[PDB]
């Protein structure tokens, strides 16, 4: 087990102002990695210019920089429903961001006009847990949503929203929820889903009728699936573990344990260039694993001022790496209280 990264808390974004619940359920970078969008229970998609956020609020030495929400947030979009998920739409030049919500609705917003441009309600009103888009498709991009109704649905955002390019029900008879959907980030044909039947599945987006690859070993719902590369995917389960899988044969390569996750979505993000897996934890911790070892290489336990009070046990509810990092990495974590924690890392 090698400890190769100096990964340290740089910035904390918090609100003095609002007592509203503000669990962060989704954190995503735009295609340039200049913008971070967050969303969750508070029906607000918030945007942050991350380099400028850190540059304009820097402190001396190794201290942590504390920034108020009103200072940190460039702007936000009020939405009709609680958000489960966010994804920027490729091929739109960072102009369009998609969301899934607790009304079962997929929305797309144009950020140049701040207006909704796409609205799809085809999951019977069952919650949408996850949204994604195919990569390197250009004009052929398609979106997909996974929902409590037990389907992953594939739709063309240029067509009328009532239409569908495909629909799969991975869990079969019991129709268990599809909790996560993820397209191959390098543009291959694989699309991975995680389901409440405790399994992951890998389909061929070009031909959804072809038999899925089944990822079987979790003992609880698969809450997340993320690609490491064209040949491997990482799942998270509410059995308290992550698992690395071969896409070629479906075997478990490695299981990762040490964090606490038996109930909530706590986030999973895979930094593909560094082969590092980040996730939240229900004991208010951020965990990072290296692909090579099943024990965490790094944990952080930041506690915002005044957390102790209140009987609500704060947890880390979302994480997201900056994918374009190679010699530097950036990990953004979101708390169940709406606090953002920005970690920056360089090699030791």
């Amino acid at each position: 087990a090698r400890y190769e990264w100096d990964l340290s808390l740089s910035t904390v974004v918090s609100s003095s102002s609002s007592s509203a619940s503000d669990v962060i359920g989704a954190i995503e970078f735009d295609p340039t990695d200049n913008i971070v969008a967050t969303a969750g229970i508070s029906r607000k998609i918030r945007f942050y210019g991350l380099p400028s956020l850190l540059r304009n609020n820097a402190v001396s030495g190794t201290g942590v920089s504390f920034v108020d929400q009103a200072t940190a947030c460039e702007y936000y979009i009020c939405t009709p429903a609680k958000l489960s998920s966010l994804r920027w739409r490729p091929g739109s030049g960072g102009r369009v961001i998609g969301s899934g919500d607790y009304d079962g609705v997929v929305m797309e917003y144009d950020l140049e006009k701040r207006t909704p441009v796409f609205e799809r309600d085809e999951h019977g009103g069952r919650r949408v847990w996850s949204v994604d888009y195919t990569r390197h498709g250009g004009a052929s991009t398609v979106g997909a949503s996974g929902s409590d109704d037990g389907t992953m649905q594939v739709w063309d955002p240029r067509c009328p929203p009532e239409e569908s390019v495909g629909v799969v029900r991975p869990a079969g008879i019991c129709r268990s929820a599809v909790c996560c959907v993820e397209f191959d980030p390098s543009g291959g044909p694989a699309v991975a889903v995680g389901c409440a039947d405790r399994k992951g599945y890998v389909y061929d987006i070009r031909k959804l009728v072809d038999p899925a690859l089944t990822l079987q070993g979790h003992t609880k719902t698969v809450s997340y699936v993320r690609f490491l590369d064209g040949g491997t995917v990482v799942t998270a389960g509410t059995d308290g573990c992550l698992k690395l899988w071969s896409v070629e044969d479906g075997r478990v390569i490695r299981t990762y344990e040490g964090h606490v996750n038996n109930r909530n979505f706590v986030g999973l993000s895979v930094w593909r260039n560094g082969a590092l897996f980040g996730c939240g934890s229900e004991n208010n911790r951020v965990f990072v694993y290296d692909r090579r070892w099943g024990k965490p290489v790094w944990v952080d336990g930041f506690e915002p001022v005044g957390m102790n009070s209140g009987s609500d046990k704060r947890f880390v509810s979302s994480v997201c790496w900056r994918q374009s990092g190679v010699d530097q990495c950036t990990l953004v974590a979101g708390g169940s209280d709406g606090v953002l924690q920005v970690y920056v890392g360089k090699r030791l």
Binding site: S18, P80, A196, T221, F265, S311, F315
Partner: protein, 386 residues
Amino acid sequence: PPRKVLIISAGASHSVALLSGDIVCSWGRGEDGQLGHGDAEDRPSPTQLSALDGHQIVSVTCGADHTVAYSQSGMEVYSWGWGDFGRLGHGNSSDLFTPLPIKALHGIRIKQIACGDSHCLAVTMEGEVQSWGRNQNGQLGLGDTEDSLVPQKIQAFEGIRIKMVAAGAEHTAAVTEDGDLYGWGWGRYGNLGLGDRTDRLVPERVTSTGGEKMSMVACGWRHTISVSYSGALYTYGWSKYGQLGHGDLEDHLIPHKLEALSNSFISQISGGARHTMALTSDGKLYGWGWNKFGQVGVGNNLDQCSPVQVRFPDDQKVVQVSCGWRHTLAVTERNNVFAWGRGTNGQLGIGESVDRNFPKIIEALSVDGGKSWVSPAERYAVVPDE
């Protein structure tokens, strides 16, 4: 003998009713606290809101994910549900899962409460208006865009007795006792009736009303409905879903009379997010607009750009109607309650999680056939378990 249903109100995903003996009941989505039972559970059937028993509640009103009730005898206003932007009026932004009194309104003579999606207004017996909650587009009428966590008087109405108000997603409208019509808040899609696309931070009189005095008003996400002393019905704003009801999908920046209903005298109106209901003097219910979930009640799921009569067993007359975001409720002359539209969270009150496109009787209400806070980790971002 079932209690008479006195008041029905529909929210974004929930429904509330007031019955004789001042009994409040609530059903539908409960995850945000909007049912007021002290838990975050949905309720598929009308469920008595026990915390308000004996409080002499005389009125209930749904916002989107919040609810307000008031007692004229107790001189107390109560609110609960989702609390962001101060829409509950308690001086903070906290969620509530049980009713709490709005202290600022204690001892005030309240004649009406209107609940927009994220703001509220109270009209007093003396015709004054206080507002609170979200104000980003000026919908509180206070002359700024700062949200207000407590009720504040609209100073622009001093000397102007207000008959009633209505609130949409981000705009507000009002009618005076003299018959003047007003609009303010978000005006991008013409729903203020002022002839331009500009928001208004204070009430602005609609100068082009066809020369008629307006008796009632109601609001949706991007449209507004008004009814004249003559009983003529006017709609204005966006009509992408046909919610204006004029036979086309054209915008209207000023009140436009709905000619197909000139035959009838409109006695009540209600605005959904994107659909519309009008009740005639005869008890005929007409609906139009967004119908994807069947919330127009005319037996299909195609949008309706012109009024269509909603049909009830034995053509019993309707005496009350209330639109939510995606469903509709109605009370008939036979003391029956009907619901239709989206029912995923049980808001139709018929023990289901299904949509319906024609009226369905709520058997629990018809003659014919606990904690203030719930931790977010128990009700949001919970991984489906099995």
